Every structure is written in C-alpha cells, then in structure tokens.
Amino acid sequence: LGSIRVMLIDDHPVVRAGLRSILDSFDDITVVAEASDGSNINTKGIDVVVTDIQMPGTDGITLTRALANAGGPPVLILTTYDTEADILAAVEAGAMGYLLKDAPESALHDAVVATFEGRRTLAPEVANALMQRVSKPRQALSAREIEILQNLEQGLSNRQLAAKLFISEATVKTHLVHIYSKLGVDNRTAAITAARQQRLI
Ligand SMILES: [Mg+2]
Ligand SMILES: [Mg+2]
Ligand SMILES: [Mg+2]
Ligand SMILES: [Mg+2]
Ligand SMILES: [Mg+2]
Ligand SMILES: [Mg+2]
Ligand SMILES: [Mg+2]
Secondary structure (H helix, E strand, O other), X not given: OOOEXXXXXXXXXXXXHHHHHHHHHOOOEEEEEEEOOOOOOOOOOXXXXXXXXXXXXXXHHHHHHHHHHHOOOOEEEEEOOOOOOOHHHHHHOOOOEEEEOOOOHHHHHHHHHHHHXXXXXXXXXXXXXXXHHHOOOOOOOOHHHHHHHHHHHOOOOHHHHHHHHOOOHHHHHHHHHHHHHHHOOOXXXXXXXHHHHOOOO
16 A cells, blocks of 8 residues: 555644644655544554554553563554653653654654554654653751651650640651651661761751
C-alpha cells in the first residue's frame, strides 16, 4: 500500500480533529480509524496507533502495554510538554515512539514513518519534558522541623514535644510525617539516625 494506515486515539475531539487534519495532509499517511479511548480496539488493518495519554476508561499507558502484550501494531504516544498526565508511566510503557503534539508537522510525519518501520522515536522534546517533570528540587528542612528532630534526639514523646513546643500533638504528628518522608525513614529512631548522618541537628 502507498499509505500508512493510522488509528488515532484521543479523548478530546477538538484536539483529535487538528491531529487528523495534519496526518491526512501527508500523501503517505491515512487515518483509517479514530477512537476516544483504548477500550475494545480492533487493530485489524492498522499499521500504527497514534495515541494520547489522558483518557477515561483505558488510557494510552494501559493501551500501550496491552498492544505490546498482543504483539499489536506499534504505538506513537503524543503528549504536551506541560501535561498533567503521568508522563513517566507513559515513557516506562515503552511505546515505539514519543512526540509532542505541537511538534513540527514534518516531525509528526517522520515519527509515524519511523514507528511503522520499527525505529524508536525518543523525541528530545519529550525527554526534556520528562526531566522537567520528575526532577523536582526539594526544600530544606524548616527551623520547626530541625527543632522537632533535636527534641526527638533527647527522647521526647509526641506529648512531651507538644508540651515543650506549645503545639498540638496532631501538629507534631503532621510534622513528623513530613520529616520522615524527607529523611527516607518511617519511625523516630531511624529519623534520628538519618538526621545525625545528614548532619542536620
Ligand atoms: Mg487528549
Ligand atoms: Mg494542514
Ligand atoms: Mg493522506
Ligand atoms: Mg503491522
Ligand atoms: Mg509548528
Ligand atoms: Mg523531511
Ligand atoms: Mg545538636
């Protein structure tokens, strides 16, 4: 056949229509099927699946894995640089290709062809979006949190901490949750050890 037969999947018909128009505009690509999620999909006659991440029912991450399990057609995942979707889970799913939805049209064409030919598209723009999303610098422990650790080191219970610092036992407990998360621990003895190793107190 002269054209690569695409199934285009997106829960947002206003966005889907723009992508369809772009894909169909190439002489070597034809959108033969559309869907609004990844459920019940029949891939007979489909050369490439082009899919969104965020969709109700079966999302693009689950669809990617399902098609992989079936030995189904290869998948190109489209997203946005500022997506609220789980971009890390999408990348971990191991689709053949990844591209942003507002990439140059030629790049979308080339991504479809690459996907069809079984060549990976790990688009730098997607990689950059992933790094931005997952690499979040975390704030220092606050003065209050350091104070709590210094008193935990002296062996104070939650009640004693509350009495000494003039904050409620519930407020103490909330702080401890946050401290334990920052320290990578789940109890008070381990927190003290970590705070000592980390030279925090
Ligand atoms: Mg969408
Ligand atoms: Mg056009
Ligand atoms: Mg066409
Ligand atoms: Mg095929
Ligand atoms: Mg453009
Ligand atoms: Mg070209
Ligand atoms: Mg000290």
